[PDB]
Short mmCIF file of all heavy atoms in Angstrom, two decimals:
data_model
loop_
_atom_site.label_atom_id
_atom_site.label_comp_id
_atom_site.label_asym_id
_atom_site.label_seq_id
_atom_site.Cartn_x
_atom_site.Cartn_y
_atom_site.Cartn_z
N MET E 16 -126.92 295.50 39.33
CA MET E 16 -126.50 294.21 39.63
C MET E 16 -126.00 293.33 38.41
O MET E 16 -126.12 293.82 37.37
CB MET E 16 -127.59 293.52 40.31
CG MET E 16 -128.03 294.38 41.49
SD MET E 16 -129.22 293.83 42.77
CE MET E 16 -128.80 292.24 42.60
N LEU E 17 -125.46 292.19 38.76
CA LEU E 17 -125.01 291.19 37.70
C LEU E 17 -126.18 290.46 37.40
O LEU E 17 -127.14 290.34 38.25
CB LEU E 17 -123.97 290.30 38.32
CG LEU E 17 -122.51 290.78 38.48
CD1 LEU E 17 -121.80 289.59 39.35
CD2 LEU E 17 -121.77 291.04 37.18
N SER E 18 -126.33 289.87 36.20
CA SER E 18 -127.44 289.03 35.84
C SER E 18 -126.96 287.55 36.10
O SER E 18 -125.71 287.30 36.15
CB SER E 18 -127.71 289.17 34.41
OG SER E 18 -126.52 288.93 33.68
N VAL E 19 -127.93 286.58 36.30
CA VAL E 19 -127.51 285.20 36.49
C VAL E 19 -126.47 284.83 35.34
O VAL E 19 -125.48 284.11 35.76
CB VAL E 19 -128.73 284.22 36.35
CG1 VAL E 19 -128.34 282.89 36.45
CG2 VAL E 19 -129.69 284.66 37.53
N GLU E 20 -126.58 285.28 34.14
CA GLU E 20 -125.63 284.98 32.98
C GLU E 20 -124.31 285.49 33.42
O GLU E 20 -123.21 284.64 33.47
CB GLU E 20 -126.08 285.47 31.75
CG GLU E 20 -127.38 284.97 31.13
CD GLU E 20 -128.68 285.15 31.94
OE1 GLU E 20 -129.11 286.26 32.34
OE2 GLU E 20 -129.30 283.98 32.13
N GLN E 21 -124.25 286.74 33.85
CA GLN E 21 -123.07 287.35 34.25
C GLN E 21 -122.32 286.61 35.42
O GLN E 21 -121.08 286.56 35.57
CB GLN E 21 -123.21 288.85 34.43
CG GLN E 21 -123.45 289.61 33.22
CD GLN E 21 -123.72 291.11 33.37
OE1 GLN E 21 -124.45 291.50 34.38
NE2 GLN E 21 -122.98 291.92 32.56
N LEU E 22 -123.15 286.23 36.42
CA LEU E 22 -122.62 285.64 37.73
C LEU E 22 -121.93 284.37 37.31
O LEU E 22 -120.88 283.99 37.76
CB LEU E 22 -123.68 285.25 38.59
CG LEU E 22 -124.05 286.20 39.72
CD1 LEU E 22 -125.19 285.88 40.46
CD2 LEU E 22 -122.81 286.35 40.59
N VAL E 23 -122.42 283.49 36.47
CA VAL E 23 -121.98 282.34 35.90
C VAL E 23 -120.79 282.54 35.26
O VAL E 23 -119.78 282.00 35.41
CB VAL E 23 -123.17 281.75 35.04
CG1 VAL E 23 -122.60 280.50 34.45
CG2 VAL E 23 -124.34 281.34 35.93
N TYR E 24 -120.89 283.50 34.29
CA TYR E 24 -119.63 283.82 33.50
C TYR E 24 -118.52 284.22 34.39
O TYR E 24 -117.39 283.89 34.17
CB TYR E 24 -119.95 285.01 32.44
CG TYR E 24 -120.86 284.54 31.37
CD1 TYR E 24 -121.53 283.31 31.37
CD2 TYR E 24 -120.99 285.44 30.28
CE1 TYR E 24 -122.42 283.01 30.30
CE2 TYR E 24 -121.87 285.10 29.09
CZ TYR E 24 -122.57 283.93 29.21
OH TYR E 24 -123.53 283.59 28.23
N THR E 25 -118.83 285.04 35.41
CA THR E 25 -117.85 285.41 36.48
C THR E 25 -117.25 284.29 37.27
O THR E 25 -115.96 284.04 37.12
CB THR E 25 -118.54 286.42 37.53
OG1 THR E 25 -118.96 287.57 37.04
CG2 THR E 25 -117.39 286.72 38.70
N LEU E 26 -118.08 283.37 37.73
CA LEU E 26 -117.62 282.33 38.44
C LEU E 26 -116.72 281.51 37.61
O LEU E 26 -115.58 280.96 37.98
CB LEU E 26 -118.71 281.36 38.89
CG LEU E 26 -118.50 280.01 39.49
CD1 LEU E 26 -117.53 280.19 40.67
CD2 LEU E 26 -119.69 279.36 39.89
N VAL E 27 -117.18 281.18 36.30
CA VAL E 27 -116.31 280.31 35.47
C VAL E 27 -115.02 280.94 35.12
O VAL E 27 -113.87 280.34 35.12
CB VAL E 27 -117.06 280.06 34.06
CG1 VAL E 27 -116.22 279.35 33.29
CG2 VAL E 27 -118.42 279.33 34.27
N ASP E 28 -114.90 282.29 34.83
CA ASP E 28 -113.71 282.86 34.56
C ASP E 28 -112.75 282.76 35.80
O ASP E 28 -111.65 282.40 35.65
CB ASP E 28 -113.88 284.41 34.22
CG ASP E 28 -112.69 285.00 33.73
OD1 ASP E 28 -112.21 284.55 32.56
OD2 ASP E 28 -111.98 285.63 34.48
N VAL E 29 -113.38 283.07 36.98
CA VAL E 29 -112.43 282.99 38.21
C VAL E 29 -111.76 281.68 38.43
O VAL E 29 -110.73 281.53 38.49
CB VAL E 29 -113.41 283.36 39.47
CG1 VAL E 29 -112.67 283.18 40.83
CG2 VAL E 29 -113.84 284.80 39.41
N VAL E 30 -112.84 280.56 38.52
CA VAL E 30 -112.45 279.28 38.59
C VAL E 30 -111.40 278.75 37.61
O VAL E 30 -110.63 277.82 37.99
CB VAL E 30 -113.81 278.53 38.52
CG1 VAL E 30 -113.55 276.96 38.38
CG2 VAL E 30 -114.66 278.76 39.66
N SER E 31 -111.31 279.27 36.44
CA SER E 31 -110.52 278.77 35.36
C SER E 31 -109.06 279.37 35.50
O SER E 31 -108.09 278.95 34.89
CB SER E 31 -110.96 279.23 33.95
OG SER E 31 -110.56 280.52 33.69
N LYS E 32 -109.03 280.26 36.47
CA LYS E 32 -107.76 281.01 36.79
C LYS E 32 -107.39 280.57 38.13
O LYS E 32 -106.61 281.20 38.81
CB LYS E 32 -107.91 282.44 36.67
CG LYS E 32 -108.28 282.82 35.29
CD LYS E 32 -108.65 284.37 35.25
CE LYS E 32 -108.83 284.76 33.76
NZ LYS E 32 -109.54 285.96 33.84
N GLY E 33 -107.97 279.44 38.71
CA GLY E 33 -107.58 278.91 40.03
C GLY E 33 -108.25 279.68 41.18
O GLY E 33 -107.75 279.53 42.29
N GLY E 34 -109.15 280.53 40.95
CA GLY E 34 -109.84 281.41 42.08
C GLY E 34 -111.03 280.65 42.59
O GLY E 34 -111.48 279.64 42.06
N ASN E 35 -111.51 281.28 43.80
CA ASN E 35 -112.76 280.88 44.41
C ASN E 35 -113.56 282.28 44.23
O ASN E 35 -112.98 283.27 44.16
CB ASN E 35 -112.59 280.64 45.88
CG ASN E 35 -112.32 279.18 46.10
OD1 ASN E 35 -111.92 278.43 45.17
ND2 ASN E 35 -112.57 278.75 47.21
N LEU E 36 -115.01 282.12 44.10
CA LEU E 36 -115.75 283.31 43.94
C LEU E 36 -116.34 283.53 45.30
O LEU E 36 -116.96 282.54 45.80
CB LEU E 36 -116.88 283.21 43.05
CG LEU E 36 -118.05 284.27 43.03
CD1 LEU E 36 -117.49 285.77 42.99
CD2 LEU E 36 -119.03 283.96 41.83
N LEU E 37 -115.97 284.62 45.97
CA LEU E 37 -116.64 284.96 47.18
C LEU E 37 -117.73 285.99 47.11
O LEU E 37 -117.44 287.16 47.21
CB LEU E 37 -115.61 285.40 48.27
CG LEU E 37 -116.11 285.73 49.70
CD1 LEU E 37 -116.97 284.42 50.29
CD2 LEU E 37 -115.01 286.20 50.55
N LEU E 38 -118.92 285.56 46.62
CA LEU E 38 -119.97 286.48 46.40
C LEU E 38 -120.70 286.94 47.65
O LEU E 38 -121.24 286.34 48.45
CB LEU E 38 -121.04 285.89 45.51
CG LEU E 38 -122.05 286.68 44.65
CD1 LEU E 38 -121.31 287.48 43.64
CD2 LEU E 38 -123.12 285.71 44.13
N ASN E 39 -120.81 288.29 47.75
CA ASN E 39 -121.43 288.97 48.80
C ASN E 39 -122.92 289.10 48.72
O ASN E 39 -123.47 289.33 47.64
CB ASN E 39 -120.71 290.35 48.94
CG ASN E 39 -121.44 291.09 50.11
OD1 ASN E 39 -121.18 290.94 51.26
ND2 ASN E 39 -122.29 291.95 49.51
N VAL E 40 -123.63 288.86 49.83
CA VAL E 40 -125.02 289.29 49.99
C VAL E 40 -125.09 290.37 51.15
O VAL E 40 -124.35 290.17 52.24
CB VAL E 40 -126.01 288.11 50.16
CG1 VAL E 40 -125.70 286.90 49.52
CG2 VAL E 40 -126.17 287.79 51.67
N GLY E 41 -125.98 291.38 51.05
CA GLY E 41 -126.06 292.29 51.94
C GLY E 41 -127.46 292.38 52.43
O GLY E 41 -128.24 293.03 51.70
N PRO E 42 -127.93 291.57 53.55
CA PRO E 42 -129.31 291.65 54.09
C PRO E 42 -129.82 293.00 54.67
O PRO E 42 -129.08 293.95 54.95
CB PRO E 42 -129.22 290.59 55.21
CG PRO E 42 -127.99 289.79 54.84
CD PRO E 42 -127.04 290.76 54.32
N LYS E 43 -131.02 293.05 54.79
CA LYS E 43 -131.65 294.18 55.38
C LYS E 43 -131.65 294.19 56.87
O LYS E 43 -131.30 293.11 57.58
CB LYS E 43 -133.24 294.24 55.11
CG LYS E 43 -133.55 294.32 53.57
CD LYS E 43 -135.00 294.51 53.33
CE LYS E 43 -135.26 294.52 51.78
NZ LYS E 43 -136.58 294.94 51.38
N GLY E 44 -131.81 295.38 57.51
CA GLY E 44 -131.71 295.43 58.94
C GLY E 44 -132.61 294.63 59.73
O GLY E 44 -132.30 294.26 60.78
N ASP E 45 -133.66 294.02 59.05
CA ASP E 45 -134.59 293.14 59.72
C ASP E 45 -134.20 291.59 59.61
O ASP E 45 -134.99 290.80 60.02
CB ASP E 45 -135.97 293.36 59.17
CG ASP E 45 -136.19 292.82 57.74
OD1 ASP E 45 -135.13 292.41 57.07
OD2 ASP E 45 -137.23 292.86 57.24
N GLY E 46 -133.13 291.38 58.85
CA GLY E 46 -132.62 290.01 58.69
C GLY E 46 -133.18 289.17 57.44
O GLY E 46 -132.98 288.04 57.27
N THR E 47 -133.70 289.95 56.53
CA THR E 47 -134.30 289.46 55.34
C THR E 47 -133.42 289.63 54.20
O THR E 47 -132.72 290.60 53.98
CB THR E 47 -135.67 289.80 54.92
OG1 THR E 47 -135.76 291.33 54.50
CG2 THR E 47 -136.66 289.62 56.19
N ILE E 48 -133.19 288.66 53.24
CA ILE E 48 -132.49 288.97 52.03
C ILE E 48 -133.17 289.43 50.83
O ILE E 48 -134.11 288.83 50.34
CB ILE E 48 -131.59 287.64 51.67
CG1 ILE E 48 -130.73 287.34 52.86
CG2 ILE E 48 -131.05 287.68 50.42
CD1 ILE E 48 -129.75 286.05 52.70
N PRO E 49 -132.90 290.74 50.42
CA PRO E 49 -133.60 291.39 49.22
C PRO E 49 -133.72 290.41 48.12
O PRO E 49 -132.88 289.89 47.48
CB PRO E 49 -132.54 292.49 48.89
CG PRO E 49 -132.05 292.76 50.30
CD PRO E 49 -131.64 291.36 50.82
N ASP E 50 -135.05 290.39 47.56
CA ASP E 50 -135.45 289.67 46.42
C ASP E 50 -134.66 289.66 45.21
O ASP E 50 -134.25 288.59 44.72
CB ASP E 50 -136.92 290.13 46.05
CG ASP E 50 -137.89 289.45 47.03
OD1 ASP E 50 -138.05 288.31 46.83
OD2 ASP E 50 -138.63 290.22 47.69
N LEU E 51 -134.10 290.72 44.94
CA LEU E 51 -133.10 290.91 43.82
C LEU E 51 -131.94 289.96 43.91
O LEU E 51 -131.54 289.37 43.05
CB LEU E 51 -132.83 292.35 43.52
CG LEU E 51 -133.70 293.24 42.91
CD1 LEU E 51 -133.26 294.75 43.12
CD2 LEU E 51 -133.57 292.93 41.41
N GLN E 52 -131.47 289.91 45.24
CA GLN E 52 -130.32 289.25 45.50
C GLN E 52 -130.59 287.80 45.51
O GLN E 52 -129.92 286.90 44.81
CB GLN E 52 -129.78 289.87 46.84
CG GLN E 52 -129.00 291.18 46.87
CD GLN E 52 -128.66 291.58 48.37
OE1 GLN E 52 -127.69 290.90 48.95
NE2 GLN E 52 -129.22 292.64 48.89
#
């Protein structure tokens, strides 16, 4: 996975190039979102 620092660096880079960051989350079959995520 990306680290909070990397996510931030990602968003900033995207945004500076006129993009939007569409970050994906992939939940568990039971409807819960994994802690790491």
